Amino acid sequence: ARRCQSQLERANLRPCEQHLMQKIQRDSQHQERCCNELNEFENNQRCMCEALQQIMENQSDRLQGRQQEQQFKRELRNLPQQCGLRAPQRCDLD
Amino acid sequence: EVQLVESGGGVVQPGGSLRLSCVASGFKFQNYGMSWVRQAPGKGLEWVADISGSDESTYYADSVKGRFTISRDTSKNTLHLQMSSPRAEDTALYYCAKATAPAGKYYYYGMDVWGQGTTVTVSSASTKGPSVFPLAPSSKSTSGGTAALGCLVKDYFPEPVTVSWNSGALTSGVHTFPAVLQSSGLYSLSSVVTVPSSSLGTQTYICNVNHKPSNTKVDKRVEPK
Amino acid sequence: QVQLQESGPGLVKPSETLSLTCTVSGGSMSSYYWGWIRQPAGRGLEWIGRIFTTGSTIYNASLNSRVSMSVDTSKNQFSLKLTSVTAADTALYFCVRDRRGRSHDSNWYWYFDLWGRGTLVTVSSASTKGPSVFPLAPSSGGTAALGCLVKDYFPEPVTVSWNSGALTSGVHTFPAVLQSSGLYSLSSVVTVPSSSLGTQTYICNVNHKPSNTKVDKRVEPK
Amino acid sequence: MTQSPATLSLSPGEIATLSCRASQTVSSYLAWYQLKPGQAPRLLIYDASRRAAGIPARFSGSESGTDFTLTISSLEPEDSAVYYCHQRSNWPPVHTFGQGTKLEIKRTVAAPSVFIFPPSDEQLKSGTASVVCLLNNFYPREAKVQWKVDNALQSGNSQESVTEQDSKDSTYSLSSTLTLSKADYEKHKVYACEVTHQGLSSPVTKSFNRGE
Amino acid sequence: DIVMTQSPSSLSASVGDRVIITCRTSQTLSRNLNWYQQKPGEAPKLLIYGASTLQSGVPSRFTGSGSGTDFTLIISSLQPEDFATYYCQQSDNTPRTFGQGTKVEIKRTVAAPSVFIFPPSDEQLKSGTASVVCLLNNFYPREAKVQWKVDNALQSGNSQESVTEQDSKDSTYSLSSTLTLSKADYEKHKVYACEVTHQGLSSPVTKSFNRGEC
Ligand SMILES: *[C@@H]1O[C@H](CO)[C@@H](O)[C@H](O)[C@H]1NC(C)=O
Ligand SMILES: [Cl-]
Ligand SMILES: [Cl-]
Ligand SMILES: [Cl-]
Ligand SMILES: [Cl-]
Ligand SMILES: [Cl-]
Ligand SMILES: [Cl-]
Ligand SMILES: [Cl-]
């Protein structure tokens, strides 16, 4: 788990933030760069969930109200699947 | 409260060695990245080095890579900077700083606690302590019901000196001027305080001058003239 | 318009360390996977390793002990270090993008879509020698042939252009041949109209990077 | 990180706008710091627009592409300080600071109180004589202070030092020190400190006769 | 490691022919079977990914198919520019592995060489060496006999050849033969000749110069 902390520290999950925000406004390479970054966590499901948790943590200031929070949380939960990566079975995004 | 206290500054000969220290408290030292940031005289902030709270990986500014070494002593809650190849550009105030965000986060939230810093001067010149002379409140330093008196702190090297009044009991009205570098290469300053003219003779006034590089601690009584 | 280009010494003594750098242009390398691929005399392609812009790596296990890669996104560069090199490490070294892209069928695929032009690295103990350039002066049917002979240099490569690249039709730069002396030699030739030999000049531009020699030789009739 | 303006002077209750331009924004994180006189740097804003703990709401940050801006509304005298923007970016991480902005807080004009100090008896026995002239608690910062010795103005043998703007009352103080050998000091009689400042109704001269 | 084996290792075909390259893998692939084309002096170029998906810009000439351990590249109508070595490659895991390559050489009609002979330069002769060059330009097939003659005497052991790779537009070769002599030996003789025998020539062609003449 110290291995996980080190790669999350060096990870750049800003493309995931931008892609997710682009996605909801609809309803270029941000997605691919995001999936590239998340691919580094595919071999450790616990670390993958921590990465999604940190994206949710950093996005609290930009989200107002439960409707916005739910709308962003749904896309975040589906992000590994949309990246063609194995998703964590259990993952609480709080 | 979070507290960072830097130490170990002084004078370093070019081509010598100096270890700076920073003792940290009020937070889980092991769970945060730490950094050194410096400020050269008459210049802005300049980042020096980072060290991770996850795996103790180290990162350096290009101007210092290969000369300085940042390190961590988790048992003593202490950050260190070794300065093994000093240069003229290294003369600066050196700050110790705590990362806002805990270790293990992809996001970066700056540095939310900084120390007051420690002063390093790179030169071959020798250490000289100050001579302390009074600035006595005569009638030429009285305006209405307020007098002015002070303390002249002359010919010391390197920076800094601290000045207090009445062992820290006197703070209001004190002005300790920034030092000026004389042509000789020695610094000089004055520290002044305004007090009511009725307090002269009744109240005692003493300036406490400390120059750590010389181990000089001088108390000088300033009597009216 | 993302492009890659290798740089680094073309000659390494055996047991010393080979170091190369790839420079990315036309866009930030950030959050993409990169790699190095090698092509020795056998003509095969050997994958050396992959590096992500977090600095994490996966190496080919044969070279893992002696290979390392590093990345600096603020320079838009990544690098390769190979220690304790032997003649077996002589090869053409390519830098590449290890792309994980989503195709129009909404699935994700891995492939090497970007490559540098490659740089030759020769492993030997022989020192560098700059070339000598000599004209192949023209002497039928309205066509004349002329050229330049590039002689006695080590290591490869030599680049040859004509009229600083303006003349490319009918140019043949021959593969270098290793002479008995241990030095390489090649010629470059052009067929031109016989009537042009009075109206237009011909210059071969010869560059030998390992020895810092850049030569322009005018080729006139005798 | 190109920071502007370098200098700013505004009155209480006004709005100060500071800006920085990031050269690149690869995994970039922007912050702003405040350096008050005598105090350790204080984080104001992190991640471009998030306000640090203990920071009043009148401080806010924003970003528009590569341009990042700090807005300080309802200015207070305590805002007198030097402000720095801060970018961490790329991997391996690189930290860049802007060149800084010195923010002065205006106040009503305040004339200096002028005091003069002859050299101590102790220093004279040491072989030198320092005469000190003090200007206390004035605004604006511009003031001309010269030593005049037997009617001759002193230029090149004096040193001047000015405090940073006071956080509480927005004033400056200033010292002017004339340093002379014992022999040179005893060669003259009248030592006068000549002062002009906009807050004064006329130029001021404080003087002493040597030996009195 | 996943071993990639291609068949044929090399082949000769004509412009307009169908070319079929098989790739077999030592383990079942899930997805990422890639095909590359490497022309001479160039880096490999991606043609196809995911076994069958054409990369953008790649001509419709190139199709891929297959699954599991059994994949095929088809060039439906070979063009001169398709002179190249073709590789299969898997990126389903690390290490990434390539096949050994399939060299595609192009059969074309016979072309007789144009022959040119070049004397050594006066600059080189000061160095004490004399290189005489004979050029055979734009011929097919590659087989050719180059005979040096000095005053009608046949030379041996003092000539080196170099051949280009097939031209990407006309599929021909060009060849150089370099006779190397000492300055003194070059002084000893007068008539320097290059005799070329080639299938496209009805009889051998000789090009010659006389030292110090024209
Ligand atoms: C690993 O490197 C060796 C060279 O030492 C090479 O022969 C081999 O093909 C490489 N492995 C792969 C999978 O390319
Ligand atoms: Cl804590
Ligand atoms: Cl980009
Ligand atoms: Cl052509
Ligand atoms: Cl905070
Ligand atoms: Cl005294
Ligand atoms: Cl992978
Ligand atoms: Cl010549």
Domains in chain E, ordered, with CATH? Answer: 4-107 (2.60.40.10), 114-210 (2.60.40.10)
E125 alpha carbon to ligand 8 midpoint, in Å?
A: 9
Give yes or no: residues B10 and B118 share one domain: yes
**Ligand 1 touching residue C39 (CB < 6 A):** no
Are E95 and C60 inside 8 Å of each other by CB? Answer: yes
Measured distance CA(E120)–CA(E189) in Å, rounded:
13
Measured distance CA(D190)–CA(D210) in Å, rounded:
6
Give yes or no: residues B163 and B183 share one domain: yes
Classify burial at E145, counting beta carbons within 10 Å of its beta carbon; exposed 0-12, middle 13-18, buried 19 or more. exposed
Q: Which ligand is nearest to the CA of C168?
A: 4
DSSP structure class, residue D139? B
Q: Is C35 in contact with C48 (CB distance < 8 Å)? A: yes
Q: Which chain E residues are closer than 8 Å to C135 by Cβ? A: 121, 123
Assess whether the previous peptide bond of B86 is cis (omega < 30° from 0).
Answer: no
Measured distance CA(A16)–CA(A33) in Å, rounded:
8
Cβ neighbors of B81 (< 8 A, separation 6 or more) are B19, B20, B36, B48, B49, B68, B69, B70, B94
At C184, the amino acid letter reads: Y
Atom of ligand 1 nearest to the CA of E95: 13
Q: Which two tokens stand for residue D154?
A: 């002193």
CA distance C46 to chain A (A): 23
- Backbone gaps in chain B, preceding residues (C–N over 2.5 A): none
Give yes or no: residues B54 and B35 share one domain: yes
For residue C157, give Cα distances in angstroms to B84, C181, C186, C211, E5. 43, 17, 10, 11, 31
Radius of gyration of chain C (CA): 21
Measured distance CA(C96)–CA(C114) in Å, rounded:
5
What angle in degrees, to the nearest 10, is found between the helix axes of A2-10 and A45-58?
A: 40
Q: Which ligand is nearest to the CA of C172?
A: 4
Answer with the one of B67, B87, B122 that is the final residue of a domain.
B122
At B143, the amino acid letter reads: S
**Ligand 1 touching residue E26 (CB < 6 A):** no
**H helix or E strand, kind and range, residue A52:** helix A45-58
Are D94 and C55 inside 8 Å of each other by CB? Answer: no
Task: Return the closest-CA partner of residue C19 out of C32, C29, C28, C6.
Answer: C6
The four Cα atoms B11, B12, B17, B23 give a dihedral, to 10 degrees, of 20
Between CA B63 and CA B56, with CA B17 as vertex, the angle to 5 degrees is 60
Give yes or no: residues B87 and B179 share one domain: no
Q: Is D134 helix (H, G, I), strand (E, B) or coil?
A: strand
**Ligand 1 touching residue E212 (CB < 6 A):** no
Strand-pair partners of B40: none
Q: Is C183 in contact with C153 (CB distance < 8 Å)? A: yes
Q: Which residue of A has its CA nearest to B55?
A: A6
Burial B163-187 (b: 16+ CB within 10 A, else e): bbbeeeebeeeebbbebeeeeeebb
Please tell me if residue D91 touches chain A, with a CB cutoff of 8 Å.
yes
Question: Residue E38: what are its φ and ψ, rounded to 5°?
Answer: -115, 110
Q: What is the CATH number of domain C3-123?
A: 2.60.40.10
Measured distance CA(E98)–CA(E3) in Å, rounded:
8
Q: Is B16 in contact with B89 (CB distance < 8 Å)? A: no
CA distance C52 to chain D (A): 10
Q: Is D124 left (phi over 0), alpha (psi -120 to 50) or beta?
A: alpha
Q: Mutate which of C62, C85, C94, C98 to test ligand 1's pocket (most atoms within 8 Å of Cβ)?
A: C62
Measured distance CA(B130)–CA(B162) in Å, rounded:
11
What residues does CATH 2.60.40.10 cover in chain C?
3-123, 132-218
Q: Is C204 in contact with C161 (CB distance < 8 Å)? A: yes
Q: Which chain C residues are closer than 8 Å to D26 by Cβ? A: 28, 30, 73-74
For ligand 1, atom 14, which residue shows the shortest CA distance? Answer: C46
DSSP structure class, residue D80? -
The four Cα atoms E176, E179, E183, E185 give a dihedral, to 10 degrees, of -160
Are A61 and D27 inside 8 Å of each other by CB? Answer: no
Q: Is B168 in contact with B184 (CB distance < 8 Å)? A: no
Classify burial at E188, counting beta carbons within 10 Å of its beta carbon; exposed 0-12, middle 13-18, buried 19 or more. exposed
A69 alpha carbon to ligand 3 midpoint, in Å?
A: 29
Question: Residue A8: what are its φ and ψ, rounded to 5°?
Answer: -65, -35
- Looking at the structure of chain B, the number of domains it has is 2
Please tell me if residue C114 touches chain A, with a CB cutoff of 8 Å.
no
Give yes or no: residues B150 and B102 share one domain: no
Q: Is A26 left (phi over 0), alpha (psi -120 to 50) or beta?
A: alpha
Q: Which two tokens stand for residue C78?
A: 């990544």
What is the stated resolution of the deposited model, in angstroms?
A: 2.2
Identify the CATH assignment for C132-218 out of 3.30.1380.10, 1.20.1250.20, 2.60.40.10, 3.40.50.2300: 2.60.40.10
Q: Which two tokens stand for residue B220?
A: 């000088």
What angle in degrees, to the nearest 10, is found between the helix axes of A45-58 and A14-26?
A: 70
Give yes or no: residues B140 and B92 share one domain: no
Are D91 and A14 inside 8 Å of each other by CB? Answer: no
Q: Is D169 left (phi over 0), alpha (psi -120 to 50) or beta?
A: alpha
Please tell me if residue B188 touches chain D, with a CB cutoff of 8 Å.
yes
Atom of ligand 1 nearest to the CA of C44: 9
DSSP structure class, residue B140? G
What angle in degrees, to the nearest 10, is found between the helix axes of A30-39 and A45-58?
A: 140
CB pairs under 8 A between C and E: 134
For residue C102, give Cα distances in angstroms to A82, C99, C204, E48. 10, 10, 46, 14
Measured distance CA(C184)–CA(E176) in Å, rounded:
15
Atom of ligand 1 nearest to the CA of E98: 14
Q: Which residue of D has its CA nearest to C54?
A: D91
Cβ neighbors of B35 (< 8 A, separation 6 or more) are B47, B48, B49, B50, B51, B96, B97, B99, B111, D95
Q: Is C161 in contact with C169 (CB distance < 8 Å)? A: no
Q: Which two tokens stand for residue D207?
A: 């003087």
Q: Which domain holds residue B198?
A: 131-221
3-state secondary structure chain C: CCEEEEECCCEECCCCCEEEEEEEECCCCCCCEEEEEEECCCCCCEEEEEEECCCCEEECCCCCCCEEEEEECCCCEEEEEECCCCHHHCEEEEEEEEEEEECCCCCEEEEEEEECCCEEEEECCCCCECCEEEEECCCCCCEEEEEEEEEEEECCCCEEEEHHHCCCCCEEECCCEECCCCCEEEEEEEEEEHHHHCCCCCEEEEEEHHHCEEEEEECCCC
**Ligand 1 touching residue E97 (CB < 6 A):** yes
Q: Which two tokens stand for residue B155?
A: 């010919």
Q: Is A55 in contact with A83 (CB distance < 8 Å)? A: no
Q: Structure solved using which method? A: X-ray
Q: Is B199 left (phi over 0), alpha (psi -120 to 50) or beta?
A: alpha
CATH number at residue B214: 2.60.40.10
Task: Return the closest-CA partner of residue E10 out of E140, E143, E100.
Answer: E100
Please tell me if residue A5 touches chain B, with a CB cutoff of 8 Å.
yes
Measured distance CA(A83)–CA(A77) in Å, rounded:
11
Task: Return the closest-CA partner of residue E94 out of A45, C35, A86.
Answer: C35
For ligand 1, atom 9, which residue shows the shortest CA distance? Answer: C46
Residue-range domains of chain A with CATH: 2-82 (1.10.110)
Q: Which chain B residues are closer than 8 Å to D114 by Cβ? A: 143
Are E161 and C118 inside 8 Å of each other by CB? Answer: no
Neighbouring chains of A at 3+ CB pairs within 8 Å? B, C, D
Q: Which of residues 98-127 of B touch D (CB under 8 A)?
A: 100, 107-112, 114-117
Of A12, A58, A61, the CB nearest to D27: A12
Cβ neighbors of E78 (< 8 A, separation 6 or more) are E13, E14, E15, E16, E17, E18, E19, E104, E106
Q: Is B172 in contact with B144 (CB distance < 8 Å)? A: no
Are C74 and D27 inside 8 Å of each other by CB? Answer: no
Give yes or no: residues B86 and B145 share one domain: no
Measured distance CA(C190)–CA(C168) in Å, rounded:
8
Q: Which residue of B has its CA nearest to A53?
A: B105
Strand-pair partners of B165: B170, B207
Give yes or no: residues B118 and B137 share one domain: no
B and E adjacent (3 or more CB pairs under 8 angstroms):
no
A43 alpha carbon to ligand 7 midpoint, in Å?
A: 9
Task: Return the closest-CA partner of residue B54 out of D53, A44, D48, A11.
Answer: A11
Q: Is E25 in contact with E44 (CB distance < 8 Å)? A: no
Residues with CB under 5 A from ligand 5 (ion): B 112; D 52-53
Cβ neighbors of D202 (< 8 A, separation 6 or more) are none
For residue C128, give Cα distances in angstroms to B192, C82, C213, E95. 73, 21, 11, 35
Question: Residue B197: what are its φ and ψ, rounded to 5°?
Answer: -65, -20
CA distance C25 to chain D (A): 15
Task: Return the closest-CA partner of residue C30 out of C80, C71, C79.
Answer: C71
Q: Which residue of C has its CA nearest to A8?
A: C54
In a 13 Å sphere around the CA of D208, the CA atoms on its Cβ side amount to 18
Assess whether the previous peptide bond of E95 is cis (omega < 30° from 0).
Answer: yes
Give yes or no: residues B9 and B42 share one domain: yes
- Terminal-to-terminal C-alpha distance of chain D: 58
Measured distance CA(C11)–CA(C212) in Å, rounded:
13
DSSP structure class, residue E30? -
Give yes or no: residues B95 and B169 share one domain: no
CA distance D44 to chain C (A): 27
Q: Is C144 in contact with C198 (CB distance < 8 Å)? A: no
Name the one residue in this structure whose structure tokens are 């590089």.
B213
Are B110 and D93 inside 8 Å of each other by CB? Answer: no
Q: Which two tokens stand for residue B74?
A: 């988790």
Task: Return the closest-CA partner of residue D162 out of B180, B45, B157.
Answer: B180
B and A adjacent (3 or more CB pairs under 8 angstroms):
yes
Sign of CA dihedral E21, E27, E29, E34: negative
Give yes or no: residues B102 and B141 share one domain: no
